[PDB]
Amino acid sequence: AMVTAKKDENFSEWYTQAIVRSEMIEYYDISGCYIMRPWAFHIWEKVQRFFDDEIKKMGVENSYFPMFVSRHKLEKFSPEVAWVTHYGDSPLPEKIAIRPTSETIMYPAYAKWIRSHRDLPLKLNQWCSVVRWEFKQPTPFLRTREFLWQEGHTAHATEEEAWELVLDILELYRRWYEECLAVPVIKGEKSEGEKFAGGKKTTTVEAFIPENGRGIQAATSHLLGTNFAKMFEIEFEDEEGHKRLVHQTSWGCTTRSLGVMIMTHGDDKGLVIPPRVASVQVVIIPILFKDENTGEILGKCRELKTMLEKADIRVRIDDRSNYTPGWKYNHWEVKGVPLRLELGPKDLAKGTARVVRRDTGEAYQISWADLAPKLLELMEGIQRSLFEKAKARLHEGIEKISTFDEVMPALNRKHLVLAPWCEDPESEEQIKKETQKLSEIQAIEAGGAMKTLCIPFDQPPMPEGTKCFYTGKPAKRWTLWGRSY
Which 3 state secondary structure label does DSSP give 207?
strand
Angle, helices 159-174 vs 38-57, to 10°: value is: 150
Q: Are 27 and 140 in contact (CB under 8 A)?
A: no
Out of 220, 250, 427, 479, point to the residue binding ligand 1TI (CB under 6 A). 220
Out of 5, 58, 96, 298, point to the residue binding a second copy (CB under 8 A). 96
Q: Which of residues 303-332 bind a second copy (CB under 8 A)?
A: 322
CA–CA distance, 375 with 171 (Å, rounded to integer)? 29
Q: Answer yes or no whether residue 225 interacts with ligand 9SF by CB under 6 A.
A: no
Pick from 311, 372, 387: nearest CA to 341: 372
Angle at 283 between CA 12 and CA 266, to 5 degrees: 20
Could you give phi then psi for residue 430, rounded to 5 degrees?
A: -65, -40
Out of 133, 196, 329, 364, point to the residue binding Cl ion (CB under 5 A). 196
**Is there a binding annotation on residue 347?**
no
- CA separation (Å) from 101 to 66, 81, 234? 11, 10, 19
Q: Answer yes or no whether residue 88 interacts with a second copy by CB under 8 A.
A: yes
Residue 230 beta carbon to ligand 1TI: minimum distance, rounded to whole angstroms: 23
Q: Answer yes or no whether residue 137 interacts with a second copy by CB under 8 A.
A: no
Here's the x/- map for ligand 1TI, 116-135, by CB under 6 A: it reads as ----------------x-x-
Q: Answer yes or no whether residue 422 interacts with ligand 1TI by CB under 6 A.
A: no
Query: In whole angstroms, what separates CA 180 from the centre of its chain?
Result: 10
Out of 9, 45, 75, 80, point to the residue binding ligand 9SF (CB under 6 A). 80
Which of 105-113, 208-216, 294-302, 337-345 is the region at the interface with a second copy (rule: CB under 8 A)? 105-113
Which 3 state secondary structure label does DSSP give 349?
helix
CA dihedral 374, 380, 381, 387 (to 10 degrees): 170
Nearer to ligand 9SF, 99 or 265 (CB): 99
Nearer to ligand 1TI, 179 or 406 (CB): 179
Q: Answer yes or no whether residue 147 interacts with ligand 1TI by CB under 6 A.
A: yes
Q: Which of residues 12-71 bind a second copy (CB under 8 A)?
A: 26, 28-30, 33-38, 41-42, 44-45, 61-70
Which 3 state secondary structure label does DSSP give 285?
strand
Q: Answer yes or no whether residue 151 interacts with ligand 9SF by CB under 6 A.
A: yes
Q: Which of residues 53-92 bind ligand 1TI (CB under 6 A)?
A: none
Q: Are 213 and 482 in contact (CB under 8 A)?
A: yes
- CA separation (Å) from 226 to 112, 149, 204, 363? 16, 25, 20, 58
**Is there a binding annotation on residue 388?**
no
- Per partner kind, with CB cut-offs from 5 to 8 A, the member of ligand 1TI, Cl ion, ligand 9SF, none near residue 81 is ligand 9SF
Residues that bind ligand 1TI (CB under 6 A): 32, 132, 134, 136-138, 142-145, 147, 149, 217-220, 252-254, 256
